[PDB]
Amino acid sequence: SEVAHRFKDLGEENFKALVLIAFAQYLQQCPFEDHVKLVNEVTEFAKTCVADESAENCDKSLHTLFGDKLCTVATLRETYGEMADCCAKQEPERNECFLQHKDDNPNLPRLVRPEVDVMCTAFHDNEETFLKKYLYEIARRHPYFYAPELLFFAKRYKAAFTECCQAADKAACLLPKLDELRDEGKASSAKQRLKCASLQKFGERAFKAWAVARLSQRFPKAEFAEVSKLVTDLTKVHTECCHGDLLECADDRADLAKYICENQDSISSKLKECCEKPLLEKSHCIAEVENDEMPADLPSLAADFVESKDVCKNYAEAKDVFLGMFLYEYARRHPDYSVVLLLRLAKTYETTLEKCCAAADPHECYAKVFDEFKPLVEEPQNLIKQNCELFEQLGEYKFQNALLVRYTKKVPQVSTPTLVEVSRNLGKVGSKCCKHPEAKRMPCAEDYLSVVLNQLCVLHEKTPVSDRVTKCCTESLVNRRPCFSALEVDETYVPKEFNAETFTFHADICTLSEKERQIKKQTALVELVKHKPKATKEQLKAVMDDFAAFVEKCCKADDKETCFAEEGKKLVAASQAA
Amino acid sequence: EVQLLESGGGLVQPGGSLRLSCAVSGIDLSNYAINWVRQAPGKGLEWIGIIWASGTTFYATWAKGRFTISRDNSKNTVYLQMNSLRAEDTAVYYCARTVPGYSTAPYFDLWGQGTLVTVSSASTKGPSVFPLAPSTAALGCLVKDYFPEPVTVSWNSGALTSGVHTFPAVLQSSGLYSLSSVVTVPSSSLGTQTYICNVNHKPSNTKVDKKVEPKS
Amino acid sequence: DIQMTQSPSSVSASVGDRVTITCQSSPSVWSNFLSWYQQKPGKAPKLLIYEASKLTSGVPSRFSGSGSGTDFTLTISSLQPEDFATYYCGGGYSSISDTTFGGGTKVEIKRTVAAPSVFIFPPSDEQLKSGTASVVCLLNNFYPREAKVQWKVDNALQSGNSQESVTEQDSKDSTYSLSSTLTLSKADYEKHKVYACEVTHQGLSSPVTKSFNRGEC
């Protein structure tokens, strides 16, 4: 009895919430009421199994149990489409089919959040329906959100309404918290999206390597085997969540969390506070734990990896273990290196051994291996310090502007709305990582960019418009950053015409926040680049400054829609002389 | 398995004399007829002469008199004697075998590396290598003033290969050859990553390794 | 006399397509003595077909030979990017010492237009210490091969002091690369400031330039 085993383990509430999330992730189009029914029906059946694991139908796989429930209301293509195809299949075909039909960007209108009064009123009405509403919406919009974690954001989302609706300044208490939960949410969904992509597109070997690096950095004092034991467990966990097995993913996570807390003195000394918290807070806390203090006098690596007499004998015997040790030792010693950079150094070490080991004089051939690392560690450091400077001088706004052009000229074929989004998000890598010193920078920046870039890829996958994007996206997962920054001006691309209505601003612009107004401009800028790429340098910076001043004036011209109307369908060629 | 190795080609002074040899490794060759085909830079193929298993040798009309094929079967090597060489003799000379089974047919299966013979009176001058420093932009090297051809350029002793474009040598109005071997690299790699072009011109036993690094 | 004419002199066809190369000899070649060779850049020729239509071992089925007497045809049923090469047809003429190859056809692949991304490198300091100045202008990876590269020093359009080279079609992206190299003495070079390079290519709506001002950085 599996459904029963997971129900007794996780507890009713978490079980209910997880199944609802599994349902909102498969059918992101079905209404909240529909899913609620199905989830409450699965929870019944789950109880009948807890009271009789031998009861008819209680020993069949979760895929069967859950897949059956989904096919009770999936033969309605007039609202779904090809999900009926999945039902005419037997497990695990039916399961893999569903997963494959997870829409990264559903045709779902972002949900503008009501006022504090409205929300708090709705919350106090039916506290359960309110929260389930939350889970439903999040999951269906982010089909690859880390399930267990989502439950954690729901526990804090509730608590935020729990403490703020009983407050003096309800909006002052609730909004900064709802904004933060929103930021940490996207973040959690994106950062997980990348993990699922790693496992699904590059295999388990890949993710395990990533984990080994990230975990060796976080628990530098832990022994290799304790790290290895953790990487295996963590991988099994993410493999389930990414494969839609949420109930077993949360179960195994919790078990892994238990292990970690029971073995602190062998993993990290930063975990003591984490291992106080309730299970949901504990888990989130552990994944957010700060790197431990690196053990003091660490030894040279060249000893066991370069001068040793067994290097090649060891690299041949167990390559995954020898290299794992190399990554573990190099990672733990460099919490200042991005995970990707660490993986590159590992790949370098590997290749030079693959070459040298079978040579006449191996020991002399790879004798300078470590020297190859230098230009690999510096390239990113330099590009950072430089970009960070540029960022300090341009401000986030003018920095996104610079990146808007750089990336619009790189892949013109990409949607303008999509260019503005990705560019703006990438420009946020300046504000979010330049604040840290050159010690915490690379891992901050480069790993964040990995996420934004992965998001780009998975978004481009749907409707591909550039083979260059698809290249970088499908090639090495580790080098996606370098590959993207690599790209140069696309001289091929042909001008997007010139719709004189695309360069005509209206009154409605004057009542938007400065952020919106910036988006409006950045959008027009992308278009300007599309209509005149190749030949255009900081002469765009001249038109960009002319739009800001031109809008600033019109929004204060005692205007009657005029300043913008006339100086719009006719002022275009004024500035369009260049 | 079976491949023809030629050699003996290089810079020759007009009216000079040269002997290209062809040695095969992997087969007998004593039972086969070997041909000689040349090809001037940019032009097509031009059959010269042939030597059968026996000693009998036939020559193209134009060649008979200046070129002379011969075979040293005690050493598994067929030579091609070039006398009274003219500037129009400059061409990549190939050593090809007539596919076993034919004799007069124009069928040649096994060829040779093909040695280049530059028949010119000019003396042999090594190349000078100049850095074509960067403006993700590219850099490269400029191998100027060398003769005769050929010259080989490598990047970071072989390490860097993709992105590299070694241009075809051209003769300068000064009679000497010139070329540029560039490579496209990620801009942010400049300064951080060392870029060296290795130029080698064996005709003059010239070797250089020029480091290409942005200027300012 | 003999004279074996091969046509077209060169041709561009997309992958997939079928390329047809003809070879017309003036005196009817001897009995079937008509071979077809393939020569890839640098590498030597490779026997593809003999007896006009017989393929040799290790030759793609897509290569087919036909024809008799004075007209022979090499046909590539489905062009592949690896078929990029110059082809030659050799014939026999009862005279033996008459063996002659066609002019050869040059096959280059078709791939969407692609403007050349330009660069411009001013002379090196080591070279100016020789009294010579070479300004190179690279037009890397583009298509088609037709491109116009003009030099303007202080807007003074040049002619007769620059020789450009071009590489074969790339085996990756099927594109070319062009290097226009303007050479002036040192004195000629230090006499001016604005060294530019004008590139007009079918893939550019506007003839772009990549200049630099002597000395500056």
Pairing of strands B57-59, B3-7: unpaired
By Cβ distance, the residue of C99, C127, C136 closest to B180 is C136
- Report yes or no: C7 and C74 within 8 Å, Cβ to Cβ: no
Superfamily of domain C1-110: Immunoglobulins (2.60.40.10)
Residue C33 CA: distances (Å) to CA of B46, B103, C60, C68: 17, 11, 21, 10
Range of the domain at B182: 122-216
Q: Do A382 and B193 touch (CB under 8 A)?
A: no
A142 is in an annotated binding site: no
The domain defined by C111-214 carries CATH number 3.40.640.10: no
Judging contacts by C-beta atoms under 8 Å, the chain C residues touching residue B132 are 121, 124, 136
Which residues on neighbouring strands pair with residue C181, listed in sequence order? Answer: C136, C163
Number of domains in chain B: 2
Residue C99 CA: distances (Å) to CA of A376, B56, B60, C2: 57, 17, 8, 9
Closest residue in chain C to residue A492, using alpha carbons only: C114
Q: Given B66, B86, B121, which residue is the final one in a domain?
A: B121
Judging contacts by C-beta atoms under 8 Å, the chain A residues touching residue C142 are 491
Q: Given A103, A131, A165, which residue is the final one in a domain?
A: A103
B191 touches chain A (CB under 8 A): yes
- Report yes or no: A121 and A165 within 8 Å, Cβ to Cβ: no
Mark out chain C residues that contact chain A at CB-CB < 8 A.
112-117, 142, 203-206, 208
Number of domains in chain A: 6
CA distance B72 to chain C (A): 23
* Amino acid (one-letter) located at C70: T
Q: Do C206 and A534 touch (CB under 8 A)?
A: yes
Query: C206, C209, C210, C211: which to substitute to probe chain A, counting the most A Cβ within 10 Å?
Result: C206
- Report yes or no: A380 and A341 within 8 Å, Cβ to Cβ: yes
The two tokens of residue A458 are 């998975």
Shared domain check, B13 and B116: yes
Range of the domain at A458: 379-490
A9 is in an annotated binding site: yes
Q: How was this structure determined?
A: X-ray
The DSSP letter of residue C123 is P
- Report yes or no: A283 and A188 within 8 Å, Cβ to Cβ: no
| Chain B residues 137-156 with CB within 8 Å of chain C | 137-140, 142, 144
What is d(CA A525, CA B106) in angstroms, rounded to the nearest whole number? 65
Closest residue in chain A to residue B195, using alpha carbons only: A375
CA distance B154 to chain A (A): 18
| Chain C residues 61-100 with CB within 8 Å of chain B | 88, 90-92, 96-100
Judging contacts by C-beta atoms under 8 Å, the chain C residues touching residue A492 are 112-115, 203
CB neighbours of residue B176 within 10 Å: 16
Question: Start-end ranges of CATH 2.60.40.10 in chain C?
Answer: 1-110, 111-214
Q: Given B121, B148, B183, which residue is the final one in a domain?
A: B121
Q: Do B105 and C50 touch (CB under 8 A)?
A: yes
Q: Do B46 and C101 touch (CB under 8 A)?
A: yes
Q: Given B61, B89, B121, which residue is the final one in a domain?
A: B121
C1 touches chain B (CB under 8 A): no
Report whether the peptide linkage leading into residue A92 is cis, meaning its omega lies within 30 degrees of zero: yes
Query: Does an H or E element contain A518, and which?
Result: helix A514-531
Q: Do C206 and A488 touch (CB under 8 A)?
A: no
- Would you say how long chain C is, in residues? 217
CA distance C17 to chain A (A): 23
**Chains touching chain B at 3 or more Cβ pairs under 8 angstroms?**
A, C
- Report yes or no: B146 and C140 within 8 Å, Cβ to Cβ: no
By Cβ distance, the residue of A488, A495, A534 closest to C208 is A534
What is d(CA C181, CA C121) in angstroms, rounded to the nearest whole number? 10
Q: Do C90 and B180 touch (CB under 8 A)?
A: no
Q: Domain for residue A554, yes or no?
A: yes
B105 touches chain C (CB under 8 A): yes
Q: Among C29, C49, C46, which Cα is nearest to C92's? A: C29
Shared domain check, B103 and B62: yes
Judging contacts by C-beta atoms under 8 Å, the chain A residues touching residue C203 are 491-492
Q: Do A383 and B137 touch (CB under 8 A)?
A: no
Query: Does an H or E element contain A246, and which?
Result: helix A246-262
Q: What is the CATH number of the domain that holds B127?
A: 2.60.40.10
Show Cβ contacts of residue A235 under 8 Å, excluding neighbours closer than 6 positions. Answer: A199, A204, A207, A208, A211
Q: Domain for residue A529, yes or no?
A: yes
Annotated resolution, angstroms: 3.6
What is d(CA C153, CA A399) in angstroms, rounded to the nearest whole number? 35
C-alpha radius of gyration, chain A, whole number: 27
Judging contacts by C-beta atoms under 8 Å, the chain B residues touching residue A383 are 188
CA distance C50 to chain B (A): 6
- B31 φ, ψ to 5°? -100, 5
What is d(CA A505, CA A549) in angstroms, rounded to the nearest whole number? 13
What is d(CA A525, CA C190) in angstroms, rounded to the nearest whole number? 40
What is d(CA C74, CA C35) in angstroms, rounded to the nearest whole number? 10
Pairing of strands B115-119, B11-12: parallel
Q: Among A574, A414, A430, which Cα is nearest to A484's? A: A414
The two tokens of residue A529 are 């680049």
Shared domain check, A99 and A16: yes
Judging contacts by C-beta atoms under 8 Å, the chain C residues touching residue A535 are 206, 208
- A275 φ, ψ to 5°? -85, 30
